[PDB]
């Protein structure tokens, strides 16, 4: 019962893959709240609690688009520390994820109802069936 | 700059009042004798010189005064008080 392996068990990997226009960026930004909240939760108890301005309405308005590459969020989450690894989702893109779904043990799928199961999802399942 | 040896800064702050305040009170005693030079009373000048001599020798002893400034003060101030007397 050494704590080394007990926190080996507290380190997990989410592959994260989807269709184009599915919502990778929004769900990662909200797990930051979610993760940020976990940071706030971690920062929730103490002598004092500090959080970045809940962004204000005037600047709340602004935006960016089209994705591409990937990002990694380690997190400070309460229970475990489960990593993320973003990837650009297209057919001309996503040659990153052919070699970084080998990195990630698990797999998250994001499927829209207007899009459904398309050739993107069939190619991603052809990737993920090779390693179970 | 971020440095582990910043202790010599604030400790010198701990210097720049206290020792200097000693220097402050030192020179005020010296200026008191100049008041006697503006007074013309040789007995008050001798009393002020006897009041300022051990404290300026103590300030020359503690490393603030380099025992030649205070010697110059004793020299020219003794010359003034026995030229007046």
């Amino acid at each position: 019962l050494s704590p080394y392996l007990q926190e080996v068990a507290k380190r997990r990997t989410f592959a994260i893959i989807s269709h184009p226009d599915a919502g990778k960026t929004t769900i990662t930004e909200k797990v930051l709240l979610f993760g940020q909240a976990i940071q706030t939760a971690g920062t929730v108890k103490g002598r004092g609690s500090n959080q970045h301005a809940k962004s204000d309405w005037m600047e709340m308005e602004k935006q960016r688009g089209i994705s591409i590459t990937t990002s990694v969020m380690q997190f400070p989450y309460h229970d475990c520390l489960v990593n993320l690894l973003d990837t650009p989702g297209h057919e001309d893109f996503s040659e990153d994820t052919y070699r970084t779904l080998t990195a990630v043990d698990c797999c998250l799928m994001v499927i829209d109802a207007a899009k459904g199961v398309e050739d993107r999802t069939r190619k991603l399942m052809e990737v993920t069936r090779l390693r179970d | 700059n971020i440095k582990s040896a910043k202790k010599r800064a604030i400790q010198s702050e701990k210097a720049r009042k206290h020792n200097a305040s000693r220097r402050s009170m030192m020179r005020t005693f010296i200026k008191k004798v100049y008041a006697a030079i503006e007074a013309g009373d040789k007995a008050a000048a001798q009393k002020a010189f006897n009041e300022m001599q051990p404290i300026v020798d103590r300030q020359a002893a503690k490393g603030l005064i380099h025992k030649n400034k205070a010697a110059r003060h004793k020299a020219n101030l003794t010359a003034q008080i026995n030229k007046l007397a």
């Binding site: 940020q36 990694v72 380690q74 989450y77 990593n83 080998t102 | -």
Partner: protein, 262 residues
């Protein structure tokens, strides 16, 4: 908000991964952090390469000395970036099962393995063969060195492999996908200032990379001296304008210790 409980309860321990000998479990030593991407970096003042790693096996040390297996060298790496909330945080060690970021300068390619003495390789690199889109023709031709370095800086990546012909103009940008707007937007950075607007120029099929064994590829270089092309990483594929030229190259019999580099 309900996903987090499922992430805690359903996902197992990080599984062992296959080597040439056997699977290395998550309780052993000899850090197996090989590099996955060399990502298209945002550049504040420096590059750093990036080093996403499989450090699943072994808890970190601050002054640990890694071993480059494919070049077999003892490399002392003490600086390791942790991706805390996206920002590249301070020098920090962690618990195994994490992904780092290190500081490389044109040394480590995709999939270069690391151990502390186990001189074996994994079963990775699923990277593909490109589809040759157009060119570099250097609009505003002042200061070539930002593309003679900075796109060759991008040539080590899995998406971009820059091909240099002998004639010192018309440098081919390697794309495996179709959308080369990524590199065009990446040409507007602190060390990227040349535009290179695109047109239609036909170079057909992928430039199959091959570097034969000694005493035999010298005459292969000599007989078609106008038909060679330097590659990203000092390689020479053949030159690919048609399938018939590749058939003549197969007719020429280049016996090779073959490595794909793709």
């Amino acid at each position: 908000d309900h996903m987090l409980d499922g992430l805690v309860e359903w996902a197992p321990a990080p599984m062992p991964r296959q080597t040439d000998t056997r699977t290395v479990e998550a309780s052993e030593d000899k850090f197996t952090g090989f590099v996955f991407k060399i990502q298209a970096n945002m550049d504040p003042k420096h590059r750093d390469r990036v080093a996403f790693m499989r450090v699943v096996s072994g808890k970190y040390e601050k002054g640990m000395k890694l071993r480059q297996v494919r070049t077999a060298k003892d490399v002392v790496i003490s600086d390791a970036l942790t991706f805390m909330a996206g920002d590249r945080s301070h020098v920090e060690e962690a618990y195994p099962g994490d992904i780092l970021g290190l500081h490389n300068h044109g040394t480590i390619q995709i999939g270069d393995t690391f151990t502390q003495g186990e001189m074996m390789k994994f079963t990775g690199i699923p990277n593909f063969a490109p589809e040759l889109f157009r060119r570099i023709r250097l609009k505003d031709p002042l200061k070539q060195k930002q593309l003679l370095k900075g796109l060759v800086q991008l040539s080590e990546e899995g998406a971009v492999q820059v091909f240099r012909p002998i004639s010192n103009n018309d440098l081919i940008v390697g794309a495996v996908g179709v959308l080369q707007f990524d590199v065009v937007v990446a040409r507007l950075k602190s060390e990227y200032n040349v535009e290179a607007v695109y047109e239609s120029v036909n170079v057909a099929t992928a430039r199959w990379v091959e570097c034969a064994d000694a005493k035999k590829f010298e005459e292969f270089k000599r007989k078609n001296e106008s038909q060679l092309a330097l590659d990203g990483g000092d390689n020479l594929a053949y030159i690919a304008t048609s399938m018939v030229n590749l058939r003549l190259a197969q007719e020429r019999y280049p016996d090779v210790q073959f490595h794909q580099t793709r």
